[PDB]
Ligand binder design. Structure first.
Ligand SMILES: C/C(=C\CNc1ncnc2c1ncn2[C@@H]1O[C@H](CO)[C@@H](O)[C@H]1O)CO
Length: 377
């Protein structure tokens, strides 16, 4: 039958299909090409995607997300210890492995990470089925280049639970390289700079006569666009307290409304120099009305932007490469749309321009759908 392509991201997923020589990245039921990797277990209903993410504000212990950080790992791994301290839903030790515990109609219910990832995959599968008007039983699914066999197998198991045979796992840098059509002839060294909503990954990908190999990987598992929004949140929470004697952190609903407008303002500031952040009655009887400039957006985040170069230096050192050896730079993730990020990368590479796309959050799924096409011939 069909083989679809799915980017199973830390913060979001994305599904493409390959049909009539075209890749189509598909809209979810809300009209969006990326779906938050969230599942909520509230009041006897299970929700997946944006409807689940919206439950996080009032039901933080029931709203599961970032399960990609746990999948195929051990409970005592230092990364999983840090993630348990950050994540609001209960994580329990099941015979050495992290499991997620929530309540369904008050009953304690414990899921493997792959069971929660399966729910995300099932939703992506259903989008493909509605679009193709036929069942889908097969997929290409992406993983991070640094995933080990246990992490890849757990991802395959998520597919099996979702009724998907994962015919091939490909790494996220290879998927991006396919999407951008990087010339497969001869030898090319590529720096894949992938700055998403929650995670930063850098890879040196070598393409040699059609063979893809990731020579080195490095990153920052807690650096992404959400952190840039939080720097802005922190600044306007201080300001609103100074002006109004209201600490917005005292009202969870106010924080949720602020985060949504700050994310919009941040995106506007990739295009314009100044934008208004407006929320009527952010609490009852008090409007939020602020201007944010690109300059202040950059000042609030400059240290985090510059931090992204530390993994770039590490992979060049791991690969024993000089900057000159990189032939092209491919940007992945919505956060690479920030002008200052591009300028910092361009400048580090002693002036060389980074290659980039137009829909960098869809490039991985697009390449997974190409891989699906390559496998069908
Ligand atoms: C219109 C245009 C640029 C404006 N867009 C963006 N500017 C900055 N960050 C962005 C943008 N798009 C997605 N992200 C983040 O990417 C992460 C992964 O979803 C999330 O943190 C998003 O906030 C120029 O084409």
């Amino acid at each position: 039958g069909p083989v679809i392509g799915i980017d199973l991201g830390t913060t979001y997923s994305c599904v493409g299909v390959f049909k009539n020589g075209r890749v189509e990245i598909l809209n979810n039921e809300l009209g969006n090409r990326i779906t938050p990797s969230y599942v909520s277990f509230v009041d006897g209903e299970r929700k997946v995607g944006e409807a689940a993410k919206l439950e996080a504000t009032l039901h933080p212990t029931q709203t599961v997300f970032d399960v990609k950080r746990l999948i195929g790992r051990k409970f005592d791994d230092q990364e999983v210890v840090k993630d348990r301290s950050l994540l609001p839903y209960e994580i329990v030790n099941n015979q050495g492995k992290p499991n997620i515990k929530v309540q369904i109609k008050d009953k304690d219910t414990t899921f493997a990470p792959e069971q929660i990832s399966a729910m995300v995959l099932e939703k992506m599968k259903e989008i493909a089925q509605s679009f193709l008007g036929k069942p889908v039983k097969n997929a290409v699914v992406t993983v991070p280049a640094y995933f080990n066999d246990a992490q890849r197998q757990a991802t395959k198991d998520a597919g099996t639970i979702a009724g998907l045979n994962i015919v091939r796992i490909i790494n996220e840098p290879t998927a991006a390289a396919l999407a951008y059509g990087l010339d497969k002839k001869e030898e090319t060294s590529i720096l894949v700079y992938d700055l998403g909503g929650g995670t930063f990954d850098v890879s040196i990908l070598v393409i040699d006569n059609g063979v893809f190999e990731v020579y080195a990987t490095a990153g920052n598992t807690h650096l992404g666009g959400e952190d840039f929004d939080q720097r802005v949140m922190d600044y306007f929470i201080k300001m609103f307290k100074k002006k109004n004697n209201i600490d917005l952190r005292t009202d969870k609903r106010a924080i949720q409304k602020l985060r949504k407008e700050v994310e919009i303002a941040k995106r506007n500031l990739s295009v314009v120099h100044s934008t208004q952040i407006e929320i009527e009655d952010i609490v009852e009887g008090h409007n939020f009305s602020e201007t944010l400039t690109r300059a202040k957006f950059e000042e609030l985040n400059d240290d985090l932007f510059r931090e992204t170069l530390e993994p770039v230096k590490k992979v060049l050192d791991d690969a024993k490469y000089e900057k000159s050896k990189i032939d092209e730079i491919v940007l992945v993730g919505g956060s690479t749309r920030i002008p200052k990020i591009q300028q910092i990368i361009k400048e580090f590479f002693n002036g060389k321009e980074p290659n980039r796309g137009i829909n960098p959050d869809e490039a991985v799924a697009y390449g997974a759908a190409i891989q699906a096409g390559i496998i069908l011939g």
